[PDB]
Write a protein that binds this ligand. Structure first.
Ligand SMILES: O=C(O)CN(CCN(CC(=O)O)CC(=O)O)CC(=O)O
Ligand SMILES: [Ca+2]
Ligand SMILES: [Ca+2]
Ligand SMILES: [Ca+2]
Ligand SMILES: [Ca+2]
Ligand SMILES: [Cl-]
Ligand SMILES: [Cl-]
Ligand code: NA
Length: 388
Protein backbone atom coordinates (compact mmCIF):
# COMPACT_ATOMS: atom_id res chain seq x y z
CA UNK A 1 0.00 0.00 0.00
CA UNK A 2 1.43 3.42 -1.04
CA UNK A 3 2.23 5.78 1.91
CA UNK A 4 3.72 9.28 2.36
CA UNK A 5 4.75 11.14 5.56
CA UNK A 6 6.08 14.68 5.99
CA UNK A 7 7.51 16.33 9.17
CA UNK A 8 8.44 19.97 9.80
CA UNK A 9 11.74 19.34 11.67
CA UNK A 10 12.81 22.95 12.38
CA UNK A 11 11.58 26.51 11.87
CA UNK A 12 14.49 28.98 12.16
CA UNK A 13 12.82 32.31 13.17
CA UNK A 14 16.15 34.27 12.65
CA UNK A 15 17.09 32.89 9.17
CA UNK A 16 13.28 32.56 8.27
CA UNK A 17 13.92 29.04 6.91
CA UNK A 18 12.46 25.59 7.54
CA UNK A 19 13.80 22.03 7.36
CA UNK A 20 11.41 19.25 6.21
CA UNK A 21 11.79 15.47 5.82
CA UNK A 22 9.63 12.42 5.17
CA UNK A 23 9.29 8.79 4.13
CA UNK A 24 7.47 6.92 1.34
CA UNK A 25 6.35 3.33 0.72
CA UNK A 26 5.84 2.04 -2.86
CA UNK A 27 7.02 5.36 -4.40
CA UNK A 28 9.80 4.84 -7.01
CA UNK A 29 13.19 6.36 -6.14
CA UNK A 30 13.76 9.50 -8.34
CA UNK A 31 10.05 10.48 -8.20
CA UNK A 32 9.25 13.90 -6.64
CA UNK A 33 7.35 14.98 -3.49
CA UNK A 34 5.53 18.31 -4.08
CA UNK A 35 5.41 20.48 -0.96
CA UNK A 36 3.37 23.55 -0.01
CA UNK A 37 3.93 25.67 3.09
CA UNK A 38 0.88 27.89 3.76
CA UNK A 39 0.84 30.69 6.36
CA UNK A 40 -1.94 32.31 8.51
CA UNK A 41 -2.73 34.75 5.58
CA UNK A 42 -2.88 32.07 2.79
CA UNK A 43 0.58 32.96 1.29
CA UNK A 44 2.14 29.75 -0.19
CA UNK A 45 5.70 28.54 -0.56
CA UNK A 46 6.06 25.82 -3.25
CA UNK A 47 8.93 23.28 -2.96
CA UNK A 48 9.91 19.89 -4.46
CA UNK A 49 12.14 17.07 -3.19
CA UNK A 50 13.44 13.79 -4.70
CA UNK A 51 12.68 10.35 -3.14
CA UNK A 52 15.95 8.53 -2.32
CA UNK A 53 16.89 4.84 -2.81
CA UNK A 54 15.47 4.22 0.76
CA UNK A 55 12.17 6.07 0.14
CA UNK A 56 13.16 9.11 2.28
CA UNK A 57 13.31 12.78 1.21
CA UNK A 58 14.34 16.07 2.87
CA UNK A 59 14.76 19.82 2.21
CA UNK A 60 17.05 22.10 4.38
CA UNK A 61 17.02 25.94 4.45
CA UNK A 62 13.65 26.31 2.66
CA UNK A 63 13.01 30.10 2.37
CA UNK A 64 9.88 31.12 4.38
CA UNK A 65 10.74 34.88 4.40
CA UNK A 66 7.68 35.34 2.07
CA UNK A 67 5.39 33.98 4.86
CA UNK A 68 3.84 35.90 7.79
CA UNK A 69 3.96 34.84 11.47
CA UNK A 70 1.43 32.39 12.96
CA UNK A 71 0.63 28.77 12.01
CA UNK A 72 2.46 27.03 9.13
CA UNK A 73 0.75 24.10 7.35
CA UNK A 74 3.02 21.82 5.32
CA UNK A 75 1.23 19.67 2.67
CA UNK A 76 3.22 16.90 0.91
CA UNK A 77 1.91 14.96 -2.14
CA UNK A 78 3.24 12.19 -4.35
CA UNK A 79 2.01 9.22 -6.43
CA UNK A 80 2.77 5.56 -5.71
CA UNK A 81 4.00 3.28 -8.58
CA UNK A 82 0.31 2.47 -9.50
CA UNK A 83 -0.67 6.19 -9.65
CA UNK A 84 -2.55 6.39 -6.28
CA UNK A 85 -2.51 9.98 -4.81
CA UNK A 86 -0.56 10.04 -1.49
CA UNK A 87 -0.79 12.99 0.94
CA UNK A 88 0.37 13.99 4.42
CA UNK A 89 0.54 17.30 6.33
CA UNK A 90 2.68 18.77 9.17
CA UNK A 91 2.31 21.93 11.26
CA UNK A 92 4.53 24.42 13.11
CA UNK A 93 4.64 28.09 14.15
CA UNK A 94 6.61 31.06 12.66
CA UNK A 95 7.70 34.04 14.87
CA UNK A 96 10.26 35.94 12.79
CA UNK A 97 8.75 39.41 13.66
CA UNK A 98 8.34 40.98 17.17
CA UNK A 99 4.77 42.34 17.60
CA UNK A 100 4.58 46.07 18.50
CA UNK A 101 2.05 48.94 18.49
CA UNK A 102 2.45 52.75 18.76
CA UNK A 103 -0.32 55.33 19.24
CA UNK A 104 0.11 59.13 19.02
CA UNK A 105 -2.26 62.10 19.45
CA UNK A 106 -2.11 64.30 16.34
CA UNK A 107 -4.33 67.02 17.82
CA UNK A 108 -6.83 67.57 20.59
CA UNK A 109 -9.19 70.13 19.01
CA UNK A 110 -10.49 72.13 22.06
CA UNK A 111 -12.85 74.13 19.73
CA UNK A 112 -14.62 71.11 18.04
CA UNK A 113 -14.06 68.71 21.09
CA UNK A 114 -12.47 66.11 18.76
CA UNK A 115 -9.19 64.16 18.64
CA UNK A 116 -7.10 62.99 15.65
CA UNK A 117 -5.10 59.79 16.49
CA UNK A 118 -2.70 57.74 14.38
CA UNK A 119 -0.32 54.84 14.99
CA UNK A 120 1.83 52.02 13.65
CA UNK A 121 1.90 48.27 14.25
CA UNK A 122 4.40 45.44 13.68
CA UNK A 123 3.25 41.79 13.12
CA UNK A 124 -0.48 42.79 13.31
CA UNK A 125 -2.51 41.51 10.29
CA UNK A 126 -4.05 44.08 7.91
CA UNK A 127 -7.86 44.42 8.59
CA UNK A 128 -6.99 43.71 12.26
CA UNK A 129 -8.81 46.02 14.74
CA UNK A 130 -7.15 48.42 17.23
CA UNK A 131 -9.24 48.89 20.41
CA UNK A 132 -8.94 52.58 21.51
CA UNK A 133 -9.88 53.99 24.93
CA UNK A 134 -9.82 57.69 25.91
CA UNK A 135 -10.08 58.33 29.69
CA UNK A 136 -10.56 61.84 31.25
CA UNK A 137 -9.65 63.34 34.69
CA UNK A 138 -13.05 62.10 36.08
CA UNK A 139 -12.69 58.47 34.71
CA UNK A 140 -15.25 59.01 31.87
CA UNK A 141 -14.38 56.83 28.81
CA UNK A 142 -14.77 57.15 25.01
CA UNK A 143 -14.31 53.84 23.10
CA UNK A 144 -13.24 53.77 19.42
CA UNK A 145 -11.90 51.27 16.87
CA UNK A 146 -9.55 51.57 13.88
CA UNK A 147 -8.59 49.16 11.07
CA UNK A 148 -4.92 48.22 10.50
CA UNK A 149 -3.86 49.00 6.87
CA UNK A 150 -1.51 47.04 4.53
CA UNK A 151 1.55 48.98 5.90
CA UNK A 152 0.32 48.27 9.50
CA UNK A 153 -0.70 51.96 10.11
CA UNK A 154 -4.10 53.07 11.55
CA UNK A 155 -5.69 56.51 12.10
CA UNK A 156 -8.92 58.21 13.24
CA UNK A 157 -10.04 61.77 12.43
CA UNK A 158 -12.49 63.90 14.41
CA UNK A 159 -13.32 61.34 17.19
CA UNK A 160 -16.05 63.04 19.38
CA UNK A 161 -14.77 63.62 22.98
CA UNK A 162 -17.55 66.13 23.95
CA UNK A 163 -18.54 63.46 26.59
CA UNK A 164 -15.14 64.01 28.36
CA UNK A 165 -14.22 66.73 30.91
CA UNK A 166 -11.14 69.03 30.80
CA UNK A 167 -7.70 68.06 32.16
CA UNK A 168 -5.28 65.24 31.26
CA UNK A 169 -6.65 62.80 28.60
CA UNK A 170 -5.13 59.30 28.45
CA UNK A 171 -5.31 57.52 25.05
CA UNK A 172 -4.83 53.70 25.19
CA UNK A 173 -4.57 51.50 22.02
CA UNK A 174 -4.32 47.68 21.86
CA UNK A 175 -4.35 44.90 19.24
CA UNK A 176 -3.16 41.28 18.85
CA UNK A 177 -0.06 40.26 16.84
CA UNK A 178 -0.16 37.16 14.60
CA UNK A 179 1.34 35.02 17.43
CA UNK A 180 -1.67 35.87 19.69
CA UNK A 181 0.22 38.42 21.91
CA UNK A 182 -1.50 41.63 23.13
CA UNK A 183 0.41 44.74 21.81
CA UNK A 184 -0.43 48.15 23.34
CA UNK A 185 0.70 51.78 23.71
CA UNK A 186 -0.69 54.93 25.36
CA UNK A 187 -0.38 58.70 24.90
CA UNK A 188 -1.56 61.71 26.92
CA UNK A 189 -2.58 65.29 26.24
CA UNK A 190 -4.52 68.21 27.68
CA UNK A 191 -8.23 68.87 27.02
CA UNK A 192 -9.42 72.44 27.65
CA UNK A 193 -12.77 72.79 25.80
CA UNK A 194 -14.61 74.58 28.72
CA UNK A 195 -13.66 77.98 30.18
CA UNK A 196 -13.58 77.72 34.02
CA UNK A 197 -15.85 80.18 35.88
CA UNK A 198 -17.28 80.79 39.38
CA UNK A 199 -20.14 83.02 40.60
CA UNK A 200 -20.95 83.83 44.27
CA UNK A 201 -24.11 85.41 45.70
CA UNK A 202 -25.14 86.62 49.17
CA UNK A 203 -28.56 84.94 49.58
CA UNK A 204 -29.22 86.43 53.07
CA UNK A 205 -27.44 88.31 55.84
CA UNK A 206 -29.40 87.55 59.04
CA UNK A 207 -28.38 90.58 61.19
CA UNK A 208 -30.34 89.14 64.22
CA UNK A 209 -28.53 85.72 64.19
CA UNK A 210 -25.32 87.45 62.75
CA UNK A 211 -25.10 84.75 60.04
CA UNK A 212 -24.84 84.74 56.22
CA UNK A 213 -26.16 82.33 53.58
CA UNK A 214 -23.91 82.16 50.48
CA UNK A 215 -24.24 80.17 47.22
CA UNK A 216 -23.01 80.12 43.65
CA UNK A 217 -22.35 78.28 40.41
CA UNK A 218 -19.22 76.99 38.67
CA UNK A 219 -18.19 75.89 35.16
CA UNK A 220 -15.37 73.33 34.61
CA UNK A 221 -14.95 72.77 38.40
CA UNK A 222 -14.70 69.07 39.38
CA UNK A 223 -17.19 67.36 41.76
CA UNK A 224 -16.20 67.85 45.47
CA UNK A 225 -13.70 70.67 44.64
CA UNK A 226 -13.25 73.06 47.60
CA UNK A 227 -14.55 76.66 47.42
CA UNK A 228 -12.70 79.07 49.77
CA UNK A 229 -14.78 82.09 50.77
CA UNK A 230 -13.88 85.28 52.64
CA UNK A 231 -16.31 87.81 54.15
CA UNK A 232 -14.72 91.25 54.70
CA UNK A 233 -16.35 94.02 56.78
CA UNK A 234 -16.03 97.86 56.64
CA UNK A 235 -13.13 97.80 59.23
CA UNK A 236 -11.07 95.17 57.31
CA UNK A 237 -12.03 92.17 59.58
CA UNK A 238 -12.18 88.86 57.62
CA UNK A 239 -14.19 85.63 58.27
CA UNK A 240 -13.18 82.50 56.24
CA UNK A 241 -15.66 79.79 55.14
CA UNK A 242 -15.35 76.75 52.88
CA UNK A 243 -17.73 74.30 51.10
CA UNK A 244 -17.58 71.88 48.13
CA UNK A 245 -19.00 71.89 44.58
CA UNK A 246 -21.84 69.44 43.64
CA UNK A 247 -22.39 67.43 40.41
CA UNK A 248 -24.31 70.39 38.80
CA UNK A 249 -21.40 72.76 39.75
CA UNK A 250 -23.48 74.55 42.46
CA UNK A 251 -22.30 75.25 46.02
CA UNK A 252 -24.17 76.54 49.13
CA UNK A 253 -23.23 77.39 52.73
CA UNK A 254 -25.96 78.46 55.26
CA UNK A 255 -25.33 79.88 58.78
CA UNK A 256 -21.80 81.26 58.22
CA UNK A 257 -20.93 82.93 61.59
CA UNK A 258 -20.21 86.67 61.09
CA UNK A 259 -20.63 87.70 64.79
CA UNK A 260 -16.92 88.84 64.61
CA UNK A 261 -17.74 91.48 61.90
CA UNK A 262 -18.92 95.08 62.40
CA UNK A 263 -21.92 96.76 60.76
CA UNK A 264 -21.73 98.25 57.24
CA UNK A 265 -20.86 96.90 53.75
CA UNK A 266 -19.65 93.29 53.43
CA UNK A 267 -17.56 91.95 50.53
CA UNK A 268 -17.76 88.20 49.89
CA UNK A 269 -15.14 86.56 47.68
CA UNK A 270 -15.21 82.89 46.52
CA UNK A 271 -12.33 81.00 44.79
CA UNK A 272 -12.05 77.44 43.43
CA UNK A 273 -9.69 75.65 41.03
CA UNK A 274 -10.98 74.60 37.54
CA UNK A 275 -9.99 71.30 35.86
CA UNK A 276 -7.04 72.93 33.97
CA UNK A 277 -5.50 74.27 37.25
CA UNK A 278 -6.87 77.89 37.05
CA UNK A 279 -8.20 79.81 40.09
CA UNK A 280 -11.75 81.03 39.26
CA UNK A 281 -13.20 83.80 41.46
CA UNK A 282 -16.19 86.10 42.01
CA UNK A 283 -17.11 88.71 44.63
CA UNK A 284 -20.52 89.98 45.89
CA UNK A 285 -21.77 92.86 48.13
CA UNK A 286 -23.77 92.38 51.34
CA UNK A 287 -24.80 94.52 54.36
CA UNK A 288 -24.72 93.82 58.12
CA UNK A 289 -26.85 95.77 60.64
CA UNK A 290 -26.70 93.71 63.91
CA UNK A 291 -26.65 96.93 66.09
CA UNK A 292 -29.17 99.81 65.73
CA UNK A 293 -27.32 103.15 65.48
CA UNK A 294 -28.13 105.58 68.31
CA UNK A 295 -26.84 108.81 69.83
CA UNK A 296 -27.89 110.59 73.07
CA UNK A 297 -26.73 114.04 74.29
CA UNK A 298 -27.11 115.57 77.80
CA UNK A 299 -26.65 119.18 78.95
CA UNK A 300 -24.87 118.39 82.27
CA UNK A 301 -23.99 121.94 83.51
CA UNK A 302 -24.58 125.59 82.56
CA UNK A 303 -22.00 127.68 84.48
CA UNK A 304 -23.74 131.09 84.37
CA UNK A 305 -20.69 132.80 86.04
CA UNK A 306 -18.01 131.49 83.54
CA UNK A 307 -20.57 131.39 80.58
CA UNK A 308 -19.74 127.73 79.79
CA UNK A 309 -21.58 124.38 79.38
CA UNK A 310 -20.54 120.77 80.05
CA UNK A 311 -22.15 118.24 77.61
CA UNK A 312 -21.96 114.40 77.51
CA UNK A 313 -23.51 111.62 75.41
CA UNK A 314 -23.62 107.94 74.44
CA UNK A 315 -23.62 106.16 71.09
CA UNK A 316 -24.46 102.70 69.73
CA UNK A 317 -22.88 101.47 66.41
CA UNK A 318 -20.64 104.60 66.02
CA UNK A 319 -16.99 103.46 65.44
CA UNK A 320 -14.70 104.72 68.23
CA UNK A 321 -12.66 107.81 67.14
CA UNK A 322 -15.60 109.11 64.98
CA UNK A 323 -16.33 112.87 65.29
CA UNK A 324 -19.46 114.08 67.13
CA UNK A 325 -20.65 117.52 65.84
CA UNK A 326 -22.40 119.67 68.53
CA UNK A 327 -24.43 122.93 68.06
CA UNK A 328 -25.76 125.10 70.94
CA UNK A 329 -28.44 127.56 69.67
CA UNK A 330 -29.74 130.44 71.85
CA UNK A 331 -33.27 132.04 71.74
CA UNK A 332 -32.29 134.60 68.99
CA UNK A 333 -30.58 132.04 66.63
CA UNK A 334 -26.84 132.60 67.59
CA UNK A 335 -24.91 129.28 67.31
CA UNK A 336 -21.81 127.77 68.97
CA UNK A 337 -20.25 124.84 67.01
CA UNK A 338 -17.96 122.23 68.65
CA UNK A 339 -16.53 118.78 67.73
CA UNK A 340 -15.27 115.95 69.95
CA UNK A 341 -14.35 112.27 69.62
CA UNK A 342 -16.38 109.09 70.40
CA UNK A 343 -14.55 106.99 73.09
CA UNK A 344 -13.84 103.21 73.08
CA UNK A 345 -17.15 102.72 75.03
CA UNK A 346 -19.24 104.92 72.63
CA UNK A 347 -19.36 107.86 75.12
CA UNK A 348 -18.27 111.44 74.41
CA UNK A 349 -18.12 114.68 76.40
CA UNK A 350 -17.28 118.39 76.06
CA UNK A 351 -16.38 120.43 79.16
CA UNK A 352 -15.96 124.21 79.54
CA UNK A 353 -17.56 125.05 76.12
CA UNK A 354 -17.61 128.89 75.70
CA UNK A 355 -21.18 130.21 75.20
CA UNK A 356 -20.32 133.86 76.08
CA UNK A 357 -21.54 134.67 72.46
CA UNK A 358 -25.11 133.39 73.30
CA UNK A 359 -27.85 135.49 75.01
CA UNK A 360 -29.98 134.69 78.09
CA UNK A 361 -33.05 132.45 77.61
CA UNK A 362 -33.57 128.95 76.11
CA UNK A 363 -30.58 126.86 74.93
CA UNK A 364 -30.94 123.94 72.49
CA UNK A 365 -28.00 121.50 72.23
CA UNK A 366 -27.91 119.30 69.05
CA UNK A 367 -25.39 116.43 68.62
CA UNK A 368 -24.82 114.36 65.42
CA UNK A 369 -22.55 111.45 64.41
CA UNK A 370 -22.37 108.93 61.49
CA UNK A 371 -23.26 105.31 62.42
CA UNK A 372 -21.62 102.31 60.71
CA UNK A 373 -24.68 101.83 58.39
CA UNK A 374 -24.26 105.49 57.23
CA UNK A 375 -27.14 107.11 59.26
CA UNK A 376 -26.94 110.65 60.75
CA UNK A 377 -27.62 109.73 64.42
CA UNK A 378 -28.90 112.79 66.37
CA UNK A 379 -30.29 113.91 69.73
CA UNK A 380 -31.11 117.30 71.34
CA UNK A 381 -31.20 118.64 74.90
CA UNK A 382 -32.71 121.85 76.30
CA UNK A 383 -31.57 124.23 79.02
CA UNK A 384 -31.22 127.91 79.86
CA UNK A 385 -28.52 130.56 80.05
CA UNK A 386 -28.88 133.23 82.80
CA UNK A 387 -25.51 135.07 82.70
CA UNK A 388 -27.07 138.65 83.04
O1 LIG B 1 -19.00 86.55 37.64
C1 LIG B 1 -18.50 85.85 36.73
O2 LIG B 1 -19.23 85.13 35.95
C2 LIG B 1 -16.99 85.99 36.52
N1 LIG B 1 -16.37 87.26 37.02
C3 LIG B 1 -14.97 87.37 36.56
C4 LIG B 1 -14.12 86.55 37.46
N2 LIG B 1 -12.79 87.17 37.57
C5 LIG B 1 -12.35 87.17 38.98
C6 LIG B 1 -11.15 88.05 39.26
O3 LIG B 1 -10.20 88.10 38.45
O4 LIG B 1 -11.15 88.68 40.34
C7 LIG B 1 -11.82 86.47 36.71
C8 LIG B 1 -11.19 85.24 37.35
O5 LIG B 1 -11.92 84.40 37.91
O6 LIG B 1 -9.95 85.07 37.29
C9 LIG B 1 -17.06 88.52 36.60
C10 LIG B 1 -17.31 88.64 35.10
O7 LIG B 1 -16.33 88.59 34.32
O8 LIG B 1 -18.50 88.84 34.68
CA1 LIG C 1 5.56 37.48 15.70
CA1 LIG D 1 -11.11 74.09 31.02
CA1 LIG E 1 -26.03 99.22 62.57
CA1 LIG F 1 -30.84 136.97 82.89
CL1 LIG G 1 15.80 16.60 -2.83
CL1 LIG H 1 -26.04 103.79 61.22
NA1 NA I 1 -31.16 132.27 74.79
Amino acid sequence: AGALTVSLDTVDNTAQTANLSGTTTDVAPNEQVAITITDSAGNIVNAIATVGADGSYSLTGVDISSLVDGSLTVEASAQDRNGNALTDSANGALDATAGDLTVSVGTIDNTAQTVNLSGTTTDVAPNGQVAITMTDSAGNIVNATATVGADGSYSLTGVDISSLVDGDLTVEASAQDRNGNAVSDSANGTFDATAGDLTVSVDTVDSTAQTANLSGTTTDVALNSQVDLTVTDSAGNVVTATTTVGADGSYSLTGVDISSLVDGNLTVEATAQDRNGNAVSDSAAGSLDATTGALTVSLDTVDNAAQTVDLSGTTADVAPNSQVNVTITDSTGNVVNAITTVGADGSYSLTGVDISSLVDGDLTVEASAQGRNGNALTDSANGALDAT
